[PDB]
Amino acid sequence: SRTTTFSPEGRLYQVEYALEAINNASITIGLITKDGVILGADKVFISKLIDKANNYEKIYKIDKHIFCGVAGLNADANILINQSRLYAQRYLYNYNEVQPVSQLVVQICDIKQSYTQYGGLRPYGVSFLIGGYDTKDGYQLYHTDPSGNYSGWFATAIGTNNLTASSVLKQEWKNDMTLEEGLLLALKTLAKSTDTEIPKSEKIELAYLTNKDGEVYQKYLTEKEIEELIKLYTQKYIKE
Amino acid sequence: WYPYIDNGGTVIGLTGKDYVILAADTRLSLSYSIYTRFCPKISKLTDKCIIGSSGMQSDIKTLHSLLQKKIQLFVLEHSHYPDIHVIARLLCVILYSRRFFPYYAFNILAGVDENNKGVLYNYDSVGSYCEATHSCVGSGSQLILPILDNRVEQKNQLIKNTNFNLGDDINFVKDAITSATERDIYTGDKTLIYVIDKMGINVNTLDLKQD
Amino acid sequence: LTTFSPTGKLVQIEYALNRVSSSSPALGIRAKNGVIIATEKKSPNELIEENSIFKIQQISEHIGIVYAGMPGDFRVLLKRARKEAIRYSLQYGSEILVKELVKIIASIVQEFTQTGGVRPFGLSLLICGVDVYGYHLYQIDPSGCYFNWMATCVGKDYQNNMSFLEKRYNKDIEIEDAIHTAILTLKESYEGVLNEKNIEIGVAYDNKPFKILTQNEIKDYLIE
Amino acid sequence: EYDRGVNTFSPEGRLFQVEYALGAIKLGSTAVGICVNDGVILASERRISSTLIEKDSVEKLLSIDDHIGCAMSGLMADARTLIDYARVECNHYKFIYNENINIKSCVELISELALDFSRPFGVALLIGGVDKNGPCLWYTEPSGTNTRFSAASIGSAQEGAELLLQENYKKDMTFEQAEILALTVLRQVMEDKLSTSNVEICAIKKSDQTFYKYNTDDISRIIDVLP
Amino acid sequence: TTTLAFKFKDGIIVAVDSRASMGSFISSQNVEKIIEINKNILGTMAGGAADCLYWEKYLGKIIKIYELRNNEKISVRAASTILSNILYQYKGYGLCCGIILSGYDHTGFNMFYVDDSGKKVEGNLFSCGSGSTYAYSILDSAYDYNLNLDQAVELARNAIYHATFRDGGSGGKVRVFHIHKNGYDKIIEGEDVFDLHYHYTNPE
Amino acid sequence: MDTLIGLRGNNFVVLAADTYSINSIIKLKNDDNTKFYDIHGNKCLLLGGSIGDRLQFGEFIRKNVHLYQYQNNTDMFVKSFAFFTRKNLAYYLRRNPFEVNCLIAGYDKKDGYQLYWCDYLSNMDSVNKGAHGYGAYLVSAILDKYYHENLTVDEALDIFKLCFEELKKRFLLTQINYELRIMYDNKVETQYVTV
Amino acid sequence: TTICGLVCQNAVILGADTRATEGPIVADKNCSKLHYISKNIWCAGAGVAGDLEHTTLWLQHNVELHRLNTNTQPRVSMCVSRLTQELFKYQGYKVCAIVLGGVDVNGPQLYGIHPHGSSCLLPFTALGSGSLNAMAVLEAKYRDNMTIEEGKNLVCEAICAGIFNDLGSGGNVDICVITKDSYQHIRPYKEPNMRLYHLPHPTIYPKGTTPILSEKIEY
Amino acid sequence: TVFSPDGHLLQVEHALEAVKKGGCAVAIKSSNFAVLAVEKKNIPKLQNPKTTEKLIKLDEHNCLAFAGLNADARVLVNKTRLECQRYYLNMDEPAPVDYIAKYVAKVQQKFTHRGGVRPFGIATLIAGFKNNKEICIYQTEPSGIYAAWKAQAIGKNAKIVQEFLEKNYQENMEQKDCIFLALKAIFEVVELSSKNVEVALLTEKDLTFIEEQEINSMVELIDQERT
Amino acid sequence: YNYNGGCVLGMSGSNCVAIACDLRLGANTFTTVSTKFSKIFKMNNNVYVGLSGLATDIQTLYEILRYRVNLYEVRQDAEMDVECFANMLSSILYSNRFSPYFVNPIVVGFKLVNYEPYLTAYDLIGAKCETRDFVVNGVTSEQLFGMCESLYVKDQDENGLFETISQCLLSALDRDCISGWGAEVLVLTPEKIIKKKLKARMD
């Protein structure tokens, strides 16, 4: 029935289907390094007639130091990004400083929680890996769900084939990870999740923060990841 | 446009053991010319509690009818005639319900509640009710209040006229109102000496100096 | 009230996508010096004057739109499209960017899915136009998402209609050469072989204002 | 079977959503109140089965004001909402009119809130006081029927206490007369012993016109008279 | 309109006059300037009569609710913070009042001052009203905080008499209330005090 | 009026204020008043103005910061705290008057000890000294004569003794009592002194 | 700020001066008071220059939106019938003396709107501070059904008369023809007599007593 | 939300059962302190602090350890922390635990009585201070009922852990003794992992956590006590 | 108002623009409370706004203008040109028509491979005074117009422009009393920016 009604088991229905609706969406990888947080993506290819060179709809920008990698309904994702950009700017307008991500996910999971509680509207079939840098506790990487129960992490692989890709980060991840070593680490889990051995490079997109006291937050071009893809060939950080 | 005028008039209150005396004048004077010599300024509410007033008639006919509405709404919801202590607190909030635009009409609440207990409540135009044994309200406020002050409270070394029967006291209020028409302008001629004894009220009238 | 489903997909959206899969075919192809759009105008008779019923409308002096669904909805979304091309033009004195415009219409379409007691839009848009960052040709989905296409079709039987574009398209095609590869994707694609001034074609016309090609103008290209 | 709507009628001329709550009030703790010529005495149980409770935070006899005490039954979470509303309007009445509100004027407003047409409040009360005209005891229902009772009982065991009061109520009974009577009906329908903790009687005397909760010390001298 | 406050080792003696003036004419002589807000907190009006008698009685509605909604005795600090916040809504509305709340809360004998602008200032020797500055001088002349009630209630009469004679605002009967550790005592009216005479001639 | 002397060192921040509670143009309701609004996160807000408006704004900004300090386990940054209360003052200006004057002071590991001045209007700015009220016209100059860099925390107390004493001699209303809120090394003592 | 307006045999010619002010000083020697409502209709207003911004741009886009709704070119009596609906509610708030008019289905009209809300058709008018000086030479040389060249020199003399005979005017003079084909934004008579040429002094480069140089090389 | 044909509430009993599938949380009262306890679980080598999923503060003296829906506590706590501070602004006193619990219970009750609003599927327990120097641990259910306790537990299989606590609950205990009693409540999570139990010692009106160092010194003693 | 004075002057060289502003924020009219209140802000890497007037709006309009720009800035990968930004300030001030926003902003920055000067003035209501030459606004605009009239060459060098704007501000600040000490000039080239704080008269 509607989202307002419960179930005899204690769970819900609309928020339970949304948790499964994101399982049929492309994967995204999160990863905290010793230099800055990095993200992964999977451009689902409906055809070869997309631009494939200027845009990508799996990783967006929230602020100059906060960025998320969305995974789920691409249509409903644009609303929360248009809603998180306001909270990331209304905090600046009210406190003259950057907003900590710990105070951003709370501000954004409440907008999801408010939908699965009243109004009689459908929930948000979206879940994303939102990370950033802050002066209070350094780099961080949070993860929201359609219910709102956010939680901090070090590496997450939501989308399709989560349990397999998350297991890769259980062993291959290390506490100390450089920026270049972290990219190669996140490159293999992004490729083996799609049951392939090498990315076609006209696929997956990556992003990285690495605050150099100014939070550069550079994204990646189709030519910049070629050098990263070539480094995977020689040094294979295999499935295992 | 000033929405506050004074029609002029007066109401005199007295007490004792089991009696209260409320008296007024019916001259509904306009700005400077007397219009009608008959406009009652006292209206009964219950069988043992009346109300007198002296401001503009716009804030008197409304205030007397609004009080009759909120008192008739209370009797058929409790099946008990209200006392004066409850009706005194009732006008305390009605007059304060319009604090920004106060009712330009001072009032007088007289009546008996217990077996004898002649009580008399008087207050200003904003709503600060205060019990009093005697009071005057209106255009002849500053002219009758000191006369009544020489009968209840004393300043004489010999406290004269300790007893106070209803017979002599009734002629005293007629003497005070007659003393108001000669020295004050707005004091009317047709007076209504309302006397509330234990059984009920009276409508004892008296015609004064048509001047 | 268009709720979810146990399979994890909106059922009203999937039903809305079937409506655009059975309407007149719309087709847009970008080039290196402009963008072109086309629509098979199914003329039922000679009573309907061509200058009244159209499938190519304007949003500004540089933005072109194409419809592909419910004809009754061909105006309400247009009114809010032109209104957004004015609200951006009032504050910002320059022209409205296509990416800034398509993200607002996609947000308008989105709000007609989550709101209770409403119906999703029964159409697919094709926004095209000259921009300061090159050319663009976007496609709006009734679900609310938008794609940054290069050459696409959204009308009836587009699974095989796009097959002409997957094999007869190059990255560097001029706008005049792309007209014949678009007409071929309409005449040689399915029925409607009597293409004699029954196709509306809009072009970006190499950074000039949006030009709606007239019937006799298309006749020069209709000879091949 | 007509149960979808909240305001649907019946072909036999009856309500449906209100009648569902009529059985919900028969599951709470039992209570009994006696209106005598000198005042009003109430009584109730205290299901504090788990000894970890504070035993004072859970109460069945709250107070509407200092002159009106009442009982509770049914949904305890909804009973507090009506009592909180009664504590407002009765106190709001004292601010307008200087005299205390009458129970006939208070029970009529406690019943109009059970006429939300949300859902009807599944709670029955035993509002009693000594406002004016001596002491009065009223018993409200979720349907809105306000019937003034001389001695009634509400709770899961209200059926047994009903016939007991019919064979025990006398008009010329004082406070100490009914105080033992308010416990003999509780001694019958009780799955425990009438100790000094399970009973929480309180009364409103006509003299002081205020209510006073009978503490643990005072009830011990009344539960040991053995009726 | 002279009001007092003491805060001794014992309760707080509160003493006021009872003259309600109106321009150049005394309206009455029996205005109760002491309003019992609760069984333990008793306020004190000043300035406008109806301007604060309503709000002092309005506090009784909010106070009596918290005494029943939480079955405990409210603090004087809470009773004072309510008046300071319900007066901002009418700050620029032309009202004019000064209230001196006092009582016995859970800790000590608290006391507060509340005005129109919201001057919630606590203390020990408050006084407010027209002829209040005179009474705020006699007290500071002789104050020790260790005054027994038999020799301290006379100070309240003397503080008003020297403040009701030098001023033309206050007058009439003199009331004086003493707060107890559980309630409050009473002393009603003097009306004519010859604290410095032998019936010889008028002083200056 | 009232004086609100503030001085920011390199490793400490001191705040000074008058402990007078002026009621009307004649009497003083109480000596040793409460003008400071201590915050848990090493921030000491100090207001100045009419006692009525000086109270509500001191509490509207104290609980609104303690709420923020609990909605996240972190403490509010001093740079953010100063610009926050400035926004509330600008917000409470087009509707209500709010004739208040404040000195915002605090401490944070990201920038050291800070100090922020304001006005009746929103005139927030980071400074090193400065005052308020009518007393500022006699104390904003003495601070420039004794403001060498690298001041020890014990030096500022001697500056105020060289400043309060001047207020006792050349001011219209000679304020004798004073309250100091030293903020040396995560400790906020209160060395209130007279004269 | 003298703005002259007249109607020729087939088009309307507007004209004004490019010199704003603040009362005692000159704001700028070049500020085109003319505007662009559409292709066949132009505008020019006087009074406060601030309120004229959100009255021209607001009218430019609202006419453009109405032009895209229908297919024909906008008509001059529609826009004037829209400003009064907003100017009446801002009778003491919005103040402007606007002169506008262009070719349409009817003849070349020229409306003159007042700040309080009054507006009527006018074949020739002048609005601004020195509008009286502009209307003076206008009424003495205004023939009916004049050519474009016959109206070009008239509006040039109408503004030049408002240039020398007025203080709140000056700078160059720009005009515009609003024929059905296109428009013209010409700036004739840009007073090149040059009574006296300036002499700018390029200061030498020693230093300027600078204590801090926090140079940054951000890309 | 409507009634049932017999008298229950299908929208409340479902929500009350929804808290049973959640992490357990146990509280225990003492003389002048009240140590809390909660048992959570986390994925190893990921999710470093669990964003302080339990033991939420409300004031300087009011801890709160909920149980149940983790995402539905944010709206419950934010609507509580606001009310805990709003009370401090209107009464100039730090909000007592009696008022917070009376507010949290009114929040959940305001969600089941109204229509078209899902009830708060979360059962909590608040441990704070009253106006006097006292400590009364409250406990609220999604139905809206609330009562104080001397020890209480909610969550997955809360009956078997509350039953054990009903037997060996002494009256007044020591700071370490009261912790051991709460640490003897690992009857929900098998093998008693130190990375699962989290306790906080609320004392002298100042909350503080308990480091894992002294946890191992107390969690290891339980294994050498079953023999 | 004549309260809390200040001035902002923008110059336009050949391919590099420059701005300058005082720093003496005054409490009252004839008072000095701070000498470190810059009146120029980095709205973008190619847009620099200079505010002048009451400090209750200099900080407020800067917070609003940053919130409106930073929100619009992230909706496109590229930056914000001055053309679309200068028209925004005329809209914010007009939206706040019968509002007290007492500011006289100055918007400078490159118009854009190429680079143009693009200086613009405004009023309290929002009149976009376009000027391809020097620009000024503030309480001392009277002593700056004539000052920047006989000392302004059309096209100047990067370093030569700084000397012109230096004497243009140090001569006007010494002539006015409220716009006191401090002059944080800001010369900027497409690849380098220069933040120099002159040594003005501390009186």
- Give E202's contacts (C-beta < 8 A, 6+ positions apart): none
The radius of gyration of chain F's CA atoms, rounded to the nearest angstrom, is 16
Indicate yes or no: CB of I71 within 8 angstroms of CB of A86.
Answer: yes
Residues of H with CB under 8 A from a CB of D: 1-8, 105, 109, 112-115, 136, 138, 143-152, 162, 165-166, 169
Q: List the one residue out of G44, G82, G87 whose CA is nearest residue G66.
A: G82
Cβ atoms of C106 and C145 within 8 Å: the answer is yes
Interface contact flag, H75 A5, Cβ < 8 Å:
no
> Within 10 A of D126 (CB to CB), how many other CB atoms are there?
26
Q: Chain-centre distance of CA A202, in angstroms?
A: 19
Domain of A238, in residue numbers? 1-240
Residue reference for tokens 């008509």: G75
Task: Give the start-end residues of each E strand in chain F.
Answer: 4-8, 13-18, 20-22, 28-31, 36-39, 43-49, 100-108, 112-117, 125-126, 178-180
Evaluate whether C106 touches A78 at the Cβ level (below 8 Å): yes
For chain A, which chains pass the contact test of at least 3 CB pairs under 8 Å? C, F, H, I
Within G47-184, residue ranges assigned H as helices are 49-69, 76-87, 131-140, 148-164
- Is the CB of residue H16 less than 8 Å from the CB of residue H67? no
Picking from I37, I9, I53, the residue whose alpha carbon sits closest to that of residue I182 is I37
H208 to chain F, any CB pair closer than 8 A? The answer is no
Q: Cβ distance I129 to G31 under 8 Å?
A: yes
Helix (H, G, I), strand (E, B) or coil at D117: coil
CB-CB contact of D156 with D29 (8 Å) = yes
Question: In sequence order, which residues have a C-beta less than 8 Å from that of residue G47 and are 6 or more positions away?
Answer: G95, G96, G97, G115
Q: Which residue from C111, C118, C142, C112 is spatially nearest to C21, judged by alpha carbons?
A: C142
Q: How many CB atoms lie within 10 A of CB H20?
A: 16
Query: What are the residue boundaries of the structural domains of chain C, listed by start?
Result: 1-224
Fold of C1-224: Glutamine Phosphoribosylpyrophosphate, subunit 1, domain 1 (3.60.20)
Q: DSSP character for H202? A: E
Residue A126's beta-bridge partner residues? A72
Q: Which residues contact F76 (CB under 8 A, 6 or more apart)?
A: F39, F41, F43, F65, F68, F69, F84
The phi, psi pair for D141, rounded to 5°, reads -135, 165
CA–CA distance, I18 with I13 (Å, rounded to integer): 8
Q: Which class is domain B1-211?
A: alpha beta
Collapse the DSSP code of I179 into the 3-class scheme (helix H, G, I; strand E, B; otherwise coil) and give the result.
coil
Spatial distance between the Cα atoms of E123 and C193, rounded to a whole number of angstroms: 99
CA distances in angstroms from D214 to D41, D179, D189, E39, E67, listed in the order given: 10, 11, 21, 21, 19
Q: Which two tokens stand for residue I181?
A: 């000490």
Half-sphere exposure of B180 (CA within 13 A, CB side): 35
- Per-residue buried b or exposed e for G97-108, using 16+ beta carbons within 10 Å of the residue's own CB: bbbbbbbbeeeb
Residues of E in contact with F22 (CB under 8 A): none
State the catalytic residues of E. Answer: 1
Q: Which CATH architecture has domain D1-227?
A: 4-Layer Sandwich (3.60)
Distance from C-alpha of E43 to C-alpha of E98, rounded to nearest angstrom: 10
Pick the CATH number of G1-219 from 3.40.50.620, 3.40.50.10860, 3.60.20.10, 3.40.30.10: 3.60.20.10
Closest-CA residue in chain H for A117?
A: H118
Residue in chain A closest to C153 (alpha carbons) equals A49
Number of neighbouring beta carbons within 10 Å of residue C86: 19
Q: CA-CA distances (angstroms) from residue A136 to A102, A144, H18? A: 10, 21, 36
Q: Which residue of A has its CA nearest to I63?
A: A93
Query: Which helix (H) or strand (E) segment is A128 a member of?
Result: strand A126-134
Residue bearing tokens 């209100």: D18
E32 touching chain D per CB within 8 A: no
* Distance of alpha carbon E118 from alpha carbon G74, whole angstroms: 61
Containing D22, the helix (H) or strand (E) segment is helix D17-22
Per the structure, how many domains does chain A have? 1
Q: Which is nearest to D31 in space by CA: D143, D142, D160?
A: D160
Stated as kind and residue range, the H or E segment containing I163 is helix I158-173
Question: CA of D76: how far to CAs of D29, D63, D79, E71, H139, in Å?
Answer: 10, 15, 5, 18, 15
How many whole angstroms separate alpha carbon I132 and alpha carbon I119?
Answer: 6
CATH of the domain at A49: 3.60.20.10
Q: How many domains, chain E?
A: 1
- Residue C192: both structure tokens together: 């409607």
Q: What span, in angstroms and rounded, lies between the C-alpha atoms of H167 and E36?
A: 50
Closest CB from F29, F50, F56 relative to E121: F29
Cβ pair H14:A6 closer than 8 A:
yes
Tell me the C-alpha distance between I61 and I104, whole Å: 11
CA distance F144 to chain E (A): 35
At D163, which helix (H) or strand (E)? helix D158-166
CA–CA distance, D66 with D27 (Å, rounded to integer): 28
Nearest one of I36, I48, I7 to I187, comparing CA atoms: I48
* Gap between the Cα atoms of G135 and G142, Å rounded: 10
Q: How far apart are CA A153 and CA D44, in angstroms?
A: 54
Tokens coding A53: 């060179």
Q: Provide the residue count of chain C.
A: 224
Complete domains list, chain H, with CATH = 1-227 (3.60.20.10)
- H partners (3+ CB pairs within 8 A) are A, D, E, F
Query: What does chain B look like in DSSP terms, one character per residue?
Result: ---------EEEEE--SS-EEEEEE--EE-SSSEEES----EEE-SSSEEEEE-S-THHHHHHHHHHHHHHHHHHHHHSS---HHHHHHHHHHHHHTTSSS--S--EEEEEE-SSS-EEEEEE-SS---EE-SSEEEETTHHHHHHHHHTTSS--SSS-------HHHHHHHHHHHHHHHHHH-SS--SEEEEEEE-SS-B--EEEE----
Q: Any residues with CB less than 8 A from the CB of G85 and at least 6 apart, and which?
A: none
**Residue F145 burial (C-beta neighbours within 10 Å; 0-12, 13-18, 19+):** exposed
Q: Token pair 């100096």 is at which residue?
A: B209
Write the burial class of residue C197 (CB in 10 Å: 0-12 exposed, 13-18 middle, 19+ buried). middle
Which residue does chain B place closest to E48, by CA atoms? Answer: B128
If phi > 0 it is left, if psi is from -120 to 50 it is alpha, else beta; for residue A178 that is beta
d(CA A159, CA F56): 51
Residues facing residue I25 across a β-bridge: I34
Q: Which of E5, E13, E11 is CA-nearest to residue E124?
A: E5
Q: Which of B130, F152, H168 is nearest to E173 (CA)?
A: B130
Residue with tokens 């009726």: D227
Resolution in A for the shown PDB structure? 3.8
Q: How far is F45 from chain A (nearest CA, A)?
A: 16
- Contact between H163 and H151 under an 8 Å Cβ cutoff? The reply is no
What's the length of chain B?
211
Q: What does the block give as tokens for G7?
A: 């109607």
Pull the structure tokens for residue E117. 């602008």
Give H17-77 as a DSSP string.
HHTTSS--EEEEE-SSEEEEEEE----TTS-SSGGG-S-EESSSS-EE--EE-STHHHHHH
Q: In which element (H, E) is residue I67 found? A: helix I55-73
Q: Please give the Cα distance from B7 to B35 (Å, whole number).
A: 10
Contact state of C99 with I75 under an 8 Å Cβ cutoff: yes
CA nearest to F22 within chain E: E119
Q: Provide the 10 A C-beta neighbour count for residue I86.
A: 25
Q: Is G156 exposed, middle or buried (0-12, 13-18, 19+ CB in 10 A)?
A: middle
G34 close to G43: Cβ distance less than 8 angstroms: yes
- CA of D63, closest CA in chain B: separation in Å? 22
Cα of G187 vs its chain's centroid, Å: 12
Q: Is A235 exposed, middle or buried (0-12, 13-18, 19+ CB in 10 A)?
A: exposed
DSSP codes of every residue in H110-169: HHHSSSSB----EEB-EE---SSS---B--B-TTS-B--BSEEEESTTHHHHHHHHHHS-
> E strands within chain E?
13-17, 20-22, 25-28, 34-36, 42-44, 98-99, 114-115, 174-178
Which residues in chain I (92-121) have CB-CB distances under 8 A to chain F?
A: 99-100
* Domain-wise residue ranges, chain D: 1-227
Helix (H) / strand (E) element for D42: namely strand D39-44
Phi-psi region of I33 (alpha: psi -120 to 50; beta: other; left: phi over 0): alpha
Strand boundaries in chain I, DSSP class E: 7-12, 17-21, 40-42, 48-50, 106-108, 119-121, 129-131, 135-138, 183-188, 193-198
3-state secondary structure A71-111: EECHHHHHHHHHHHHHHHHHHHHHHCCCCCCHHHHHHHHHH
For residue H185, give the amino acid letter.
Answer: A
How many angstroms separate the CA atoms of C35 and C128, rounded?
Answer: 7
Burial class (CB in 10 A: 0-12, 13-18, 19+), C42: exposed
- Touch test F–G: 3 Cβ pairs or more under 8 Å: no
Count the Cβ atoms, other than its own, within 10 Å of residue E190: 15
* Helix/strand/coil for F117: strand
Instruction: Return the ∠ at Cα G111 (arms to G108 and G115), rounded to 5°.
Output: 165
Residue E53's Cβ-count burial label (10 Å; 0-12, 13-18, 19+) is buried
How far is G11 from G107, CA to CA, in rounded Å? 8
Is G1 one of the annotated active-site residues of the chain?
yes
- In angstroms, the CA G197 to CA I150 distance is 11
DSSP secondary structure string for all residues of I120-138: EE--SS---EEESS-EEEE
Residues H28 and H34: their CA atoms lie apart, in Å, by 6
* CA gap D68, D63 in Å, rounded: 6
Give the N- to C-terminal CA distance of chain H in Å, as an integer.
52
* Cβ-contact H7, D21 below 8 angstroms: yes
- How many residues in total does chain H contain? 227
Torsion over CA: D73, D79, D84, D87 (sign): negative
Distances (CA, A) of A67 to A61, A78, A104, D92, I20: 5, 14, 11, 55, 36
The angle at the Cα of H210, spanning H207 to H212, to the nearest 5 degrees, equals 160
H or E segment and range at residue G17? strand G12-17
Please tell me the number of Cα atoms within 13 Å of F90 on its side-chain side: 25
> Thinking of the domain I1-203, which architecture would CATH place it in?
4-Layer Sandwich (3.60)
